[PDB]
């Protein structure tokens, strides 16, 4: 309500138009531009704005039209959560963590799903049942295929058998 | 300048010297405290030796 | 006055030095001129006359960048020296050398302005007698008492809570003496200026919605030397108004005084003057004198200045600090070692000094107590060495009683400041001068030889010590009673 | 003049050439002597203000290009054994391998009187050497 900034100046609290712009973005990297533009316009993001940004990341095809090496949707969302938690003093809600878990299960990263579970268990007060099961589905499928961990890790190596390149 | 740094090197050596001598003071301090018991416990063994 | 609006033309431009030609004659020295032609400049351009080359040509120093400046450009005199707003409307506001609000918080709406350069008080305006300035801090008001009309050097960098002490002094002086404060950042980092402003607004010394008790005047590093050499005078002018018109005991903080000397040195070099020893300007003594002498205690009020001093190359004989120390009436040393010992304010009592530590000025009881405290602390240092050499039990009864009182003194010189009532959570204290003297006098005699040592830690006065001791005793009794149950 | 001869051998002849210079400091010293008479204010110590630029232009010419290679060995005089002097210091950044000689080492009977704690080399990397 008539929110103020560090120096005691009034701030814009009408984030609805910016959220609509975010929903129009195709590649989720473009969504970051909207956050930058609204920040310049003295319209800081709200919790809804971050949730919309997470939705775009989950639903976007890729970071950009051109492929980017080592690009990861999970890392981007976690970084965004860190920005809103530490540098903006906004506590992520269940929806924010819900999007993260959906990405982890969709991407097959079942181990990160386990961590997100316990985050949802201790913070969101509850984790969606379907995502938990779908995450274990990847884990047990991975166990069946033998790919619980990268193969090179399970290979025995003596003192002089370690190639440090 | 070399002349200025000549003093700086000379003062640099004195600094290390102070630290090392400081270390000696501590080493001898421990041995002084360990050997300070003799002060209490002396002056009775040599009675009939007199 | 007769040169108000006089017209001239730019004749030469070399860096920050600009020569102006007036057909009717150059205005008086130290006069301010405005460059009407703002063709492509993003900021207004103002010049200060420093020298006269002839009856029509005058040399001047630019307060801003001289970019996009052409010869024969029109210039208009302002009618006098630089004018700065003065009044109660400047409280809680930020200004620059030109007295323009840079806080973007609306117009100042002042009712009067004063020239930057004003003659120092005459010999007949000096105070009849020296008087002490009760800062409300036990250490400062006992072992190194401040003086009205005095200049105090706050030696010690950051990391020792220097800003916290400054804020506490600003609050206490207004609380006790009802005097305002003016902070002058000379050659200060812009980042630190922002942090200080936020802290002040957080401590309510600068209440945007209420009444503030501090003015800010910032000439930053990025500004040209012509500005850094006048920002202090502008702040000093603001303080002079309160001293004279309102008759108050004002405070003037300077951060730092060395930057002021450095700025004038650069300005003198630009003019082409031959530097003196160690490259400083030949007018080093005069430059400082024209400033410090304006800081004194008059018959109407007083201005006590707390100047942050910096020693270049750790050489105390350098002309800048050496000339500065001659104008200082007190020294406050802030050390990290003391802060790492958990003693806040982190002040080294044995390293500080003051000139009013004389019975002819302060009460005889105050002087005797202070000297006794100093002697006890000095003896405590030697006993620290002795116990390390052999041990505590090796000292005499007398010496072991003195090692207990001294430790209580060291703990008792710490104090919780009201400015930190928020970020530290402990209620602040404002110990009166007489209370401090009595408390220490009783402690030295040995009256409080039964109170636990920790009861003196972060407390104000003697009553607080008794209250803390009782609470500690009650807590201990409850814990022992609970233990007996189980 | 000599550098011009080496450049021709490098470019036109496409050969790998050696270029020994003794002493490069005298080039700086000579320009300082004439600098006073050219109406230039002396810089610190007493060298010409153009010390860094003049040396840089010459040094950049002493390099190996895609056409040929020049292995340059230059002897630098450190006046009064003061390596903080502007001329010796300015030459440190224009080299790939510095050999710093010390008088104390020589006085002890050690030749060459190299102080290994002050020398450096660019190819002192495992990727280049074994």
C185 is in an annotated binding site: no
With contact defined as beta carbons under 8 Å apart, do C82 and C48 qualify? yes
CA distance C165 to C173: 12
CB A127 within 8 A of CB A120: yes
Q: How far is B11 from chain D (nearest CA, A)?
A: 18
Closest by Cα among C237, C241, C291 to C263: C291
Q: Find the residue in A nearest to C198 (Cα).
A: A7
Q: Which residue has the tokens 């003794």?
A: D22
Residues C196-205, buried b or exposed e (16+ Cβ, 10 A)?
bbebbbebbb
Determine contact, residues C263/C229, Cβ cutoff 8 Å.
yes
Does C345 sit behind a cis peptide bond, omega within 30 degrees of 0 on the bond before it?
A: yes
Q: Do A8 and C198 make contact, defined as CB atoms within 8 angstroms?
A: no
CA distance C350 to C337: 14
Does residue C327 contact residue C150 with C-beta atoms inside 8 Å? no
User: DSSP of C39-98, one letter per residue?
Assistant: SS-SS--EEEEEEESSSSEEEEEESS--TT--TT-EEEE-SSS-EEE-SGGGTT-EE-TT
Tokens coding C425: 């959570």
Say whether C189 is catalytic. yes
Long-range pairs for C97-106: beta carbons < 8 A, 24 or more residues apart: C97/C63, C97/C217, C97/C219, C97/C223, C97/C227, C97/C230, C97/C231, C97/C234, C98/C46, C98/C63, C99/C234, C102/C218, C103/A7, C104/A9, C105/C208
How many Cβ atoms are within 10 Å of C442's Cβ, its own excluded? 13
Using CA atoms, how far residue C332 sits from C27, C255, C443, D24, D67, in Å, is 44, 15, 24, 55, 69
- Token pair listed for C33: 């001129």
E-only strand ranges, A106-161? none
Experimental method, per PDB record: cryo-EM
Give the distance between the most distant pair of CA atoms in chain C: 99
Is the CB of B8 inside 8 Å of chain D's CB atoms?
no
Q: How many CB atoms lie within 10 A of CB B38?
A: 9
Q: Which residues of C272-285 are buried (b: 16+ CB within 10 A; e: fewer)?
A: eeeeeeeebbebbe
Q: How far is D101 from chain B (nearest CA, A)?
A: 16
C408 labelled catalytic: no
In eight-state DSSP terms, residue D85 is: S
| Secondary structure of residue C217 in the 3-state scheme | strand
Q: Cβ–Cβ of B29/C389 closer than 8 Å?
A: yes
- CA–CA min distance D123, chain B (Å): 31
φ, ψ at D21 (rounded to 5°): -130, 130
Is the link from the previous residue into D112 a cis peptide, with omega within 30 of 0? yes
Q: Compute the Cα dihedral for C462, C467, C468, C473 and give only its sign.
A: positive
By three-state DSSP, how is residue C324 classified? helix
Q: What is the CA radius of gyration of chain D?
A: 17
Q: Name the residue of chain C whose CA is nearest to A5's CA.
A: C198
Q: Is chain D adjacent to chain B, meaning 3+ CB pairs within 8 angstroms? A: yes
Contacts (Cβ under 8 Å, ≥6 apart) of C233: C116, C117, C291
| Token duo for residue C178 | 């009802």
Asked if B2's CB is within 8 angstroms of D80's CB, the reply is yes
Which is the catalytic residue, given C4, C189, C381, C471? C189
Which of chain A's residues have a Cβ under 8 Å away from the Cβ of C198? 6-7
DSSP 8-state secondary structure symbol assigned to residue D38: G
Interface residue D80 vs chain B (CB under 8 A): yes
Give yes or no for a contact between C109 and C87, defined as CB atoms under 8 angstroms apart: no
Resolution in Å, one decimal place = 3.7
Q: What is the C-alpha separation between C389 and D6, in angstroms, rounded?
A: 73
Catalytic member of C138, C148, C162, C213: C162
- Asked if C258 and C322 count as a contact pair (C-beta separation under 8 A), the reply is no
Q: Which residues on neighbouring strands pair with residue C152, listed in sequence order?
A: C306, C330
Decide: C333 and C347 in contact? Cβ < 8 Å. yes
DSSP state of A162: -
Q: Residue C402, CB half-sphere, CA atoms under 13 Å: how many?
A: 19
Any D CB within 8 A of B2 CB: yes
CA atoms of A1 and A12, how far apart (whole Å): 10
Q: Which residues contact A98 (CB under 8 A, 6 or more apart)?
A: A120, A124, A128, A131
The span from the CA of C51 to the CA of C65, in Å, is: 20
The residue length of chain C stands at: 486
Q: What are the beta bridge partners of residue D22?
A: D75
Q: Do C234 and C86 touch, CB atoms closer than 8 A?
A: no
Nearest chain B CA: its distance from D81 CA (Å)? 8
Q: Is the dihedral of CA C354, C358, C362, C364 positive or negative?
A: positive
- Which chains touch D (3+ CB pairs under 8 A)? B
- Encoded tokens for C345: 């304010």
Cβ–Cβ contact B33 with C under 8 A: yes
Q: Which residue of C has its CA nearest to B28?
A: C389
The rounded distance, in Å, linking the Cα atoms of C17 and C358 is 49
């Amino acid at each position: 309500a008539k929110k103020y900034d560090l120096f005691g100046y009034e701030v814009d609290t009408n984030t609805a138009p910016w959220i609509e712009k975010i929903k129009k973005c195709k590649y989720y990297d473009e969504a970051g531009e909207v956050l930058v533009n609204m920040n310049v316009s003295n319209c800081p993001p709200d919790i809804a704005t971050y949730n919309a940004t997470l939705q775009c990341i989950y639903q976007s095809p890729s970071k950009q039209s051109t492929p980017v090496d080592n690009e990861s949707k999970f890392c981007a969302m976690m970084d965004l959560l860190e920005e809103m938690q530490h540098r903006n003093r906004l506590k992520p809600n269940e929806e924010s963590w819900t999007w993260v878990m959906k990405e982890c299960v969709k991407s097959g990263q079942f181990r990160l799903g386990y961590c997100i579970q316990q985050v949802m268990e201790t913070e969101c007060k509850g984790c969606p049942a379907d995502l938990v099961k779908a995450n274990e589905a990847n884990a047990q499928k991975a166990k069946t295929e033998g790919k619980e961990h990268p193969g090179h890790l399970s290979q025995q190596a003596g003192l002089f058998d370690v190639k440090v390149e | 300048s070399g002349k200025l740094r000549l003093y700086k090197e000379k003062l640099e050596g004195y600094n290390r010297f102070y630290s090392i001598v400081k270390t000696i003071k501590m080493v001898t301090l421990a041995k002084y405290r360990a050997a300070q018991g003799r002060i209490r416990t002396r002056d009775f063994s040599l009675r009939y030796t007199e | 006055a007769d040169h108000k609006g006089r017209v001239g033309h730019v004749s030469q431009v070399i860096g920050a030095v600009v020569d102006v030609h007036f057909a009717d004659g150059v205005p008086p020295v130290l006069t301010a001129l405005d460059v009407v032609d703002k063709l492509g400049r993003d900021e207004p351009l103002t010049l200060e006359i420093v020298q006269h080359l002839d009856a029509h040509t005058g040399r001047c120093i630019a307060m801003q960048t001289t970019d996009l400046l052409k010869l024969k450009a029109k210039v208009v005199s302002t009618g006098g020296n630089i004018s700065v707003p003065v009044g109660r409307e400047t409280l809680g506001r930020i200004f620059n050398v030109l007295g323009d609000a840079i806080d973007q918080r609306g117009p100042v709406g002042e009712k009067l302005r004063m020239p930057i350069h004003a003659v120092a008080p005459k010999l007949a305006d000096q105070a009849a007698e020296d008087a002490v300035l009760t800062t409300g801090i036990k250490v400062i008001d006992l072992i190194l008492p401040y003086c009205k009309g005095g200049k105090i050097g706050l030696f010690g960098g950051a990391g020792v809570g220097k800003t916290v002490i400054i804020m506490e002094l600003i609050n206490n002086v207004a609380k006790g003496h009802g005097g305002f404060s003016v902070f002058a950042g000379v050659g200060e980092r812009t980042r630190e200026g922002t942090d200080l402003y936020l802290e002040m607004m957080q401590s309510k010394v600068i209440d945007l919605k209420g009444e503030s008790k501090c003015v800010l005047v910032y000439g930053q590093m990025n500004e040209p030397p012509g500005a850094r050499a006048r920002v202090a005078q502008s702040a000093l002018t603001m303080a002079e108004y309160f001293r004279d018109v309102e008759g108050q005991d004002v405070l003037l903080f300077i951060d730092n005084i060395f930057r002021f000397t450095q700025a004038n040195s650069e300005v003198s070099a630009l003019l082409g003057r031959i530097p003196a020893a160690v490259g400083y300007q030949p007018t080093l003594a005069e430059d400082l004198g024209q400033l410090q002498e304006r800081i004194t205690s008059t018959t109407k009020g007083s201005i006590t200045s707390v100047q942050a001093v910096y020693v270049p190359a750790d050489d105390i004989t350098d002309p800048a600090p050496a000339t500065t120390f001659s104008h200082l009436d007190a020294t406050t040393v802030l050390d990290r070692a003391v802060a790492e010992s958990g003693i806040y304010p982190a002040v080294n009592p044995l390293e500080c000094a003051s000139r009013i530590m004389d019975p002819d000025v302060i009460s005889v009881d105050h002087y005797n107590v202070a000297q006794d405290v100093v002697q006890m602390l000095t003896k405590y240092r030697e006993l620290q060495d002795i116990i390390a050499v052999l041990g505590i039990d090796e000292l005499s009864e007398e010496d072991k009683l003195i090692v207990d009182r001294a430790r209580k003194l060291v703990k008792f010189l710490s104090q919780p400041f009201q400015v930190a009532e928020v970020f530290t959570g402990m209620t602040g204290h404002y110990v009166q001068l007489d209370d401090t003297i009595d408390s220490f006098s009783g402690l030295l005699m040995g009256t409080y030889d039964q109170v636990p040592e920790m009861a003196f830690y972060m407390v104000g006065g003697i009553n607080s010590v008794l209250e803390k001791a009782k609470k500690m005793a009650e807590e201990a009794a409850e814990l022992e009673k609970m233990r007996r149950a189980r």
